[PDB]
Write a protein that binds this ligand. Structure first.
Ligand SMILES: [Mg+2]
Ligand SMILES: [Mg+2]
Ligand SMILES: [Mg+2]
Lengths: 429, 441, 441, 441
């Protein structure tokens, strides 16, 4: 039915989806136990395309658990809504990748892929007209990417028609949570540029910036952050989940978002984002949220539209309004800062609306535009990879996995090729 | 599922071990006999004690660690001590006549005497265990078996399993303070036979323990009780991830080829804090930034080798308690900020966060005050080669004078072991010499 | 509303302070006890004394400044002096045994002894104040607490408030004239711990005070009375805007990142004029142009560092009295006109006028003659790095010989503080080295 | 209409009383004989002296307070002193042979000797009085009757009236300074027999009086004259509402179950200010905020128990003089503002303003300077349990050694009084232990 599935690895991402399904449960108001306690059939109408009824009305996720060590499995296993799960999917590891990506990709990569792809495949038979599935990990290591690389390869072959919308955490330029990041990252991204269908960037520092400045929060954790992102990743299917006077699916999205298949790394904007007092400063209009939409500070990725140029831009609106406003602000904005709008893409802004906003708010905005400002991102990470690969720093942890360096060259001149590729598209008219 | 096991050797070494298992048993609060004060509820999500404290069919939960040393007096004190309900007889293997600090004796001479018993015990535990990640081995370049017999120990244990991690806690000859003079012999003879049988290990020196406990713990007159307590804390936190929920429950194997990027120079420093008094617990606040900026005080450096004379490579500031990713994170920016510090630039950043949510527990009768947040700066730099150089120069001359050599030649070692082992520190001097070279252009 | 407060340290330093508050109290003419000669009418439009002289419920108007130094003899003279009705007991904090010009002593050793009392006093005043812009801190690299204890002082006070401005008046080791020989140690140990705790500050050297008072004041035989009087004038005018109507009542915070464009090299010169005699007050006219052109006489340069050897960056010629925007303005064209002068061209002009309408007031018993117009050339150039270089070369060798080092090592400082602080002046030498480089093309 | 009456016991205690009635008589300025300097005009709206000074048919206005103590020497000095026209013979009841600081003696032994005379005097006054709210009782855990005989005193007086308030001023054993060593015995034997016969009472310790008079009064060498003067001020203001117009003339009974919310832990601190010199009266301004922020200085805490170690519960900052509801009010916001302070959260705020319009009066020959505004921080926190714990541990061991016990067993007390009274401080330790626990969820 255009239903989809979720698969998460990732040192964080395993938590991320926990929050995610948590949020969707709220938007479906079904008890933690797994039965519905809401007030409209509309939550039940399209419930299946994420959930699954069970005998007795156990309502369940179409999620897939990735992990190389059960702790997360216990963690979310210790999770509220944990009784809303299926024990089947608790597919984890006994070792952990140690985030040498070769470890999580050959060593443990080849070790535990099979049981996953089997049960996942059983989910594939459980899906009537599968629009797709949602993967989640991080692009700097192996706790997610280790195996998730193998996932994208295997299912991608196994389902060359299905959509692969991939969110994985990008290392911020400043803070290096690990120094093996350039290598895991580069080795992964070689794969992901080939095999993944959609990708959107996952920085932490942006999420900090949001929580601290625009959220005006002092105490950052993951969980709030995954609230902030699963807000958007939860919004994305809204029309696909719920009616909309102007609907567009991921196929309409990506096909209406990408000129050439190498450009499915997208940046993200969601809003509104206030602290409590703000409403008693300000109110909500479509033009208002628009005035956030093109905010670099909501630009939750390491790329700057202020520095790069919008190759593409789009808006995901959930609520009840007048599109006569919506479009009007659209075109207005597409003029107002025309210069950061790439040229030969006429009407490079594109529209949407969901008859219902997310719960709690009256109107919704989402922006997954695609400039080319990410070039500094790949340039950076490739740069650090370059330095220590001059040094071969921690190659020994690496070659101990029994990869070659020439692969590193492959993702290397590879990833540079993708960058310059974005250069010419940005530098053209 | 996630096991480790501790090995204990040398007088100071098993002193450390005693402090440690006192500690952990305190920290899970399982009573010294082997029972917990109360029943254990059935739950899931992560392991517990099961790592180390050994489940029985009843309130008997013994460590997963082993004693081995050829100087069996003191260990008997454990054989007598309060935890004589705690430990287990077959947990105990000792030698009667120790090495006399002949490396070559308990390594060669008495090296032959207890090995098989050791390996059988190891097989009993690892066979008892499932997902034992790595090996906690403790010894000392002083209590002589701590050098010699341990040297054979890893020398063979590595060849037994291999795939386990080597968790190395041994003590290093204090720079000017000491215990003997054959220490050169113990150390370097250990070292050339240490390295290729070691995965990674840290070097704890005492004089720092003194100076810092006396200033930072406000200690007037310390000893191995305080020392063993302090290392008790540091190991107490170096493995919390496998014991307690933390945001980034990093792991040893994870640490291995990432902290020590190359294979060779795979040791490090470790300055834990916050060690303060009850009168500094109050009159203070002990910020994340205070532990953090304080974490890199060279004068806080818990092994007498100046960091400021070296260039850092990695820093795994695993944290206990109420830690914020952001706050620490910006502190790490602050660490990038430190002009005086200089990093193996070809490893620009190699950082690796640790935010475990349990703040520290304190041992009654101790001198450390209670806090909310712990740091372990397991960091690796260029600096530490120098004191080695002192070791090989001291040993250089003394060996040149053939001092004591009769003792060792009497027990079955050859001279080329000596000069060649000096070639060993020659090479490692080339290693700290070279890796510190900044890659050209 | 617009407060500042003064801090005083080091023998010469509190000498300066005494001169200063003598001055201001003279200038608002509030009698030494604490009363004005007459009642104060109620009015509005701007503040008055209220900045510094402290309102009571009666004729008691004490400064908002604080004394701190560990050499408590001389301060007692204030404790005895005529203004013993002026000042206030809790305004007074001193140490008994000063540093002996151990930087490390009153910074480390006795550094620990009076800090908290200082901070409490600060909280009493700032809590007493509302719109305190910044901090007047006075000390000396000689009266040793002036280096050490002040070093901790800003080191922590900055971390207390931060958002206040740091108004730095301290004296610098005269180039060839001196007071001691450990001055290298005092200075540079101060400097690496000075910079990142300093916002901005000026360097007053004495030999200029001598040469210029003797020629320009026509002085035959001067001392700290004349010096302290002279700095009394310069600070007297550096803050008039917050005290008196001027056309462009510029402010400190205004000065901060505009005079010192970059963050680093944030110090400067200050050649006040017109300092002349009663017999040159007559036999002269003292034009705006005379003060103005005269303001840039390198031989008038009130700190012994040749401007002509440097390239100017900014010049805040705040003026007292009957000033004309136009006349000065064209004089500034004249300053653009000066071929010998060369400016950080990437800052082509950075000028910032100050035209306060009150001409100067004179202190009876003084040597300066009365005029109509004052200039303060707070200007920043490239030149001043050199004498620093003398400081680090002198200190370079002396430290190389380990001279006196026992004194400091005896009190709790480490050697890397020394070599690293030399790296500090290394960097700042790179700063005056680099910012003076003309940006290419 | 609104009466209270004072009771005086123990050497220091009646010292306090003498200071007090000296004070009040000064403050209403009725001459020591018993007359006012001039005639009293007939008016209404509120009471006057009539509370305590006793109307005659002429200029004879004696206090409503009573002396009782078994050490009758010193009281004779009152019997001799200038106020021998002031007081009244039947106002005077003393014992010849005091307790020798046997609690059990003047409580048991000599306890039997003067009680009835006391109660008769009480009946004469309370019968003389009408709207006597409560009871001012003063004694000391030192001048031994101050513990023992007072213990019976409230023990029975409470059972006499009950409905009156118990206003408890007694001194507590200074933490490290002392008077004897049986003080444990005096105190705790008092305490278990104190609590259930006490309504509420404050604990005055001396060492604070010393430290603060010497710093804040600038005192060089104090004694009970200064102490008794200081407590004279604090009680002088703790009851002004019944003596003078204030905006919120709060009352004792009002204070009772509101300051001490629960029944049990019903004692408190009291740091009065502003105590300064004539040279700090000038050189200062003494803001409402200064008294207010200053009111919570732990170093200002007038009983040697760190507030910062405790969590506040209530604070009745009754104020003398020109107080503004707003200004203080925002200061109370400032008190909510204080991060270091922590409150019995289940009592979020429990504040209770006191703004009496008379500013303080000063006693000639005194050391305190004159001001415009007074504060009494009668506040209750968690902190004060600790010094108790010192008392029961000290007493714990000493009693364990049976020290001195022969003295008390000789006079008619049983051992279970001792161990059980230790159970008493056990319970109260559970009380400060529990009420400080933050209520769950
Ligand atoms: Mg031994
Ligand atoms: Mg001095
Ligand atoms: Mg008596």
């Amino acid at each position: 039915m255009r239903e989809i599935v979720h698969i998460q690895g990732g040192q964080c991402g395993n938590q991320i989806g926990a929050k995610f399904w948590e949020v969707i449960s709220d938007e479906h108001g079904i008890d933690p136990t797994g039965t519905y306690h809401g007030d409209s059939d509309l939550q039940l109408e399209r419930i299946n395309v994420y959930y699954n009824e069970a005998t007795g009305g156990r309502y369940v996720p179409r999620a897939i658990l990735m992990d190389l060590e059960p702790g997360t499995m216990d963690s979310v296993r210790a999770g509220p809504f944990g009784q809303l799960f299926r024990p089947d999917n608790f597919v984890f590891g006994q070792t952990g990748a140690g985030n040498n990506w070769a470890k999580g990709h050959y060593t443990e990569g080849a070790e535990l892929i099979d049981s996953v792809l089997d049960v996942v495949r059983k989910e594939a038979e459980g899906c009537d007209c599968l629009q797709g599935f949602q993967i989640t990990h991080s692009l700097g290591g192996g706790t997610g990417s280790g195996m998730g690389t193998l996932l994208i390869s295997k299912v991608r072959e196994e389902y060359p028609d299905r959509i692969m919308e991939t969110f994985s955490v990008v290392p911020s330029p400043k803070v290096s949570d690990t120094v093996v990041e350039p290598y895991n990252a580069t080795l992964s991204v070689h794969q992901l540029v080939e095999n993944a269908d959609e990708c959107m960037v996952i920085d932490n520092e942006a999420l900090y910036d949001i929580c601290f400045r625009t959220l005006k929060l002092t105490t950052p954790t993951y969980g709030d952050l995954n609230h902030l992102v699963s807000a958007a990743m939860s919004g994305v299917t809204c029309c696909l989940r719920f009616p909309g006077q102007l609907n567009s699916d991921l196929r309409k999205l990506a096909v209406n978002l990408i000129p050439f298949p190498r450009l499915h790394f997208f940046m993200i904007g969601f809003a509104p984002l206030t602290s409590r007092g703000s409403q008693q400063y300000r109110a909500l209009t479509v033009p208002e949220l628009t005035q956030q939409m093109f905010d670099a500070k909501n630009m939750m990725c390491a790329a700057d539209p202020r520095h790069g140029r919008y190759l593409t831009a789009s808006a995901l609106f959930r609520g009840r309004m007048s599109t006569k406003e919506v479009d009007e602000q659209m075109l207005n904005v597409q003029n107002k800062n025309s210069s950061y709008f790439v040229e030969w893409i006429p009407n490079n802004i594109k529209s949407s609306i969901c008859d219902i906003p997310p719960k709690g708010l009256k109107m919704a905005v989402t922006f997954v535009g695609n400039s080319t400002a990410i070039q500094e991102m790949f340039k950076r990470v490739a740069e650090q990879f370059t330095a220590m690969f001059r040094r071969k720093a921690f190659l020994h942890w690496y070659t101990g996995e029994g990869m070659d360096e020439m692969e590193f060259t492959e993702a290397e001149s590879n990833m540079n090729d993708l960058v310059s590729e974005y250069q010419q598209y940005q530098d053209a008219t | 599922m996630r096991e480790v096991i501790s090995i204990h050797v040398g007088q100071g070494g098993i002193q450390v071990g005693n402090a440690c298992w006192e500690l952990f048993c305190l920290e899970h609060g399982i009573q010294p006999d082997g029972q917990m004060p109360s029943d254990k509820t059935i739950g899931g999500g992560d392991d517990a004690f099961n790592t180390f404290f050994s489940e029985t069919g009843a309130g008997k939960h013994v460590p997963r660690a082993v004693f081995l040393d050829l100087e069996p007096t003191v260990i008997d004190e454990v054989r007598t001590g309060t935890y004589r309900q705690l430990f287990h007889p077959e947990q105990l293997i000792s030698g009667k006549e120790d090495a006399a600090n002949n490396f070559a004796r308990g390594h060669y001479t008495i090296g032959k005497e207890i090995v098989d018993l050791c390996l059988d015990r190891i097989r009993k535990l690892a066979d008892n265990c499932t997902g034992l990640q790595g090996f906690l081995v403790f010894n000392s370049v002083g209590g002589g078996t701590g050098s010699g017999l341990g040297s054979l120990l890893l020398e063979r244990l590595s060849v037994d399993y291999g795939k386990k991690s080597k968790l190395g806690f041994t003590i290093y000859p204090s720079p000017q303070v000491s215990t003997a003079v054959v220490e050169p012999y113990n150390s370097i003879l250990s070292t050339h036979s240490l390295l290729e049988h070691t995965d990674v290990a840290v070097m704890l020196d005492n004089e720092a323990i003194y100076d810092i406990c006396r200033r930072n713990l406000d200690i007037e007159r310390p000893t191995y009780t305080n020392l063993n307590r302090l290392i008790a804390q540091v190991i107490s936190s170096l493995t919390a991830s496998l014991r307690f929920d933390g945001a980034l429950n990093v792991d040893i194997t994870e640490f291995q080829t990432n902290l020590v990027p190359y294979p060779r120079i795979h040791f490090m420093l470790s300055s834990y804090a916050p060690i303060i008094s009850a009168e500094k617990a109050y009159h203070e606040q002990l910020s994340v930034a205070e532990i953090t900026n304080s974490a890199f005080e060279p004068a806080n450096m818990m092994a007498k080798c100046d960091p400021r004379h070296g260039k850092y490579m990695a820093c795994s500031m695993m944290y206990r308690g109420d830690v914020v990713p952001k706050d620490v994170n910006a502190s790490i920016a602050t660490i990038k900020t430190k002009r005086t510090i200089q990093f193996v630039d070809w490893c620009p950043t190699g950082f690796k966060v640790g935010i475990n949510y349990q703040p520290p527990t304190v041992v009654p009768g101790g001198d450390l005050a209670k806090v909310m947040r712990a740091v372990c700066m397991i960091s690796n730099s260029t600096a530490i080669a120098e004191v080695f150089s002192r070791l090989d120069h001291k040993f250089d001359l003394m060996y040149a004078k053939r001092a004591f050599v009769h003792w060792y030649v009497g027990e079955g070692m050859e001279e080329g072991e000596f000069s060649e082992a000096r070639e060993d520190l020659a090479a490692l001097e080339k290693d700290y010499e070279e890796v510190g070279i900044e890659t050209a252009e």
